[PDB]
Amino acid sequence: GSKPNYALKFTLAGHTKAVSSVKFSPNGEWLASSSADKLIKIWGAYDGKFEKTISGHKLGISDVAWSSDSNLLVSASDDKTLKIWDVSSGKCLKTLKGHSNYVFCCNFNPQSNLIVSGSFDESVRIWDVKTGKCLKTLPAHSDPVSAVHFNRDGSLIVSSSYDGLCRIWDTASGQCLKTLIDDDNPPVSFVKFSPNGKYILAATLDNTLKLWDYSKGKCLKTYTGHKNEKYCIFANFSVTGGKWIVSGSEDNLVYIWNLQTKEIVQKLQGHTDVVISTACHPTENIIASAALENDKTIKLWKSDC
Ligand SMILES: COC(=O)NCCCCc1ncc(CO)[nH]1
Numbered sequence: 001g002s003k004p005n006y007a008l009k010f011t012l013a014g015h016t017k018a019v020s021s022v023k024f025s026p027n028g029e030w031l032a033s034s035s036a037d038k039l040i041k042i043w044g045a046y047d048g049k050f051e052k053t054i055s056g057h058k059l060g061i062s063d064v065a066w067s068s069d070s071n072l073l074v075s076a077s078d079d080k081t082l083k084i085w086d087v088s089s090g091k092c093l094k095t096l097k098g099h100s101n102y103v104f105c106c107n108f109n110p111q112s113n114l115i116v117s118g119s120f121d122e123s124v125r126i127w128d129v130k131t132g133k134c135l136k137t138l139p140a141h142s143d144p145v146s147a148v149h150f151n152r153d154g155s156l157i158v159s160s161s162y163d164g165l166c167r168i169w170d171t172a173s174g175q176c177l178k179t180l181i182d183d184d185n186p187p188v189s190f191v192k193f194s195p196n197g198k199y200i201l202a203a204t205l206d207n208t209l210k211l212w213d214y215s216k217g218k219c220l221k222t223y224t225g226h227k228n229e230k231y232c233i234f235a236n237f238s239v240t241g242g243k244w245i246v247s248g249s250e251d252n253l254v255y256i257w258n259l260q261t262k263e264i265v266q267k268l269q270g271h272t273d274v275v276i277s278t279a280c281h282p283t284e285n286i287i288a289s290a291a292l293e294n295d296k297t298i299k300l301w302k303s304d305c
Pocket residue numbers: 019020021062063104105146147148189190191230231232233234276
């Protein structure tokens with residue numbers, strides 16, 4: 001259909017502080033959640049059945065990411081570390097030390113041999129997953145790094161920052177290929193590549209989402225209507241039904257846009273605080289949405305389209 005009809009299926013509770021992110025396992029069976037409560041909780045994507053807690057970080061966690069094979073997780077913490085976890089045993093495999101301030105964002109490359117991290121120390125770091133050692137430190141930005149993402153073949157890294165810049169990096173050399181957004185500001189609160197790796201989705205703290213052509217360096221689409229002036233809110237490409245942009249908002253709603261028409265096609269109501277994080281299931285029309293400390297719940301939504 002030409003509009004989704006996402007409806008609340010489950011409300012997942014357990015976190016005792018603000019939830020920071022939610023990500024579906026690539027294999028679709030797990031939802032992972034991180035929180036300011038220093039915990040990672042694993043949930044069944046289809047029944048929301050609480051699976052396990054993963055503990056070890058000494059301070060709050062801002063991001064969590066899956067390896068390609070759904071077996072490993074990596075988390076970014078205010079304790080200035082990342083931890084690589086084995087999901088099955090729930091054990092810390094490695095602790096990545098090097099950042100001199102909070103680690104805000106992380107992702108595996110598709111090969112899942114590397115992890116990219118963004119920090120308040122204004123650097124992007126590339127880590128070897130096998131040895132937990134830092135391979136490279138990029139003096140990426142002049143303010144905290146809000147987001148990092150590898151493209152589909154893992155040859156580029158896109159990073160965003162409160163310095164109002166979005167930069168793309170050559171993984172192998174760590175040299176800057178392009179400075180996509182060269183504004184004094186507003187703060188770039190989030191960036192990721194599109195699934196084909198042609199486009200960058202970029203959020204700015206003037207309630208604006210923009211789809212960029214990486215090669216051309218030009219803004220293709222603008223999405224508006226939501227509120228985003230304070231928080232680094234994740235945005236997603238929904239690709240299992242109709243082609244949507246998904247994002248949280250500071251008005252406690254999940255916003256869904258038609259990618260092409262830039263039209264608002266649904267607003268999800270239920271959260272009682274800022275929706276900080278959203279995730280689109282890899283195979284089913286299901287959304288995970290996560291909220292800050294007044295709510296602390298994860299909501300699973302299902303659509304027919
Ligand atoms: C400005 O600080 C926050 O927004 N705190 C909320 C928790 C962190 C949410 C987040 N972590 C990573 C991203 C985007 O890469 N967004």
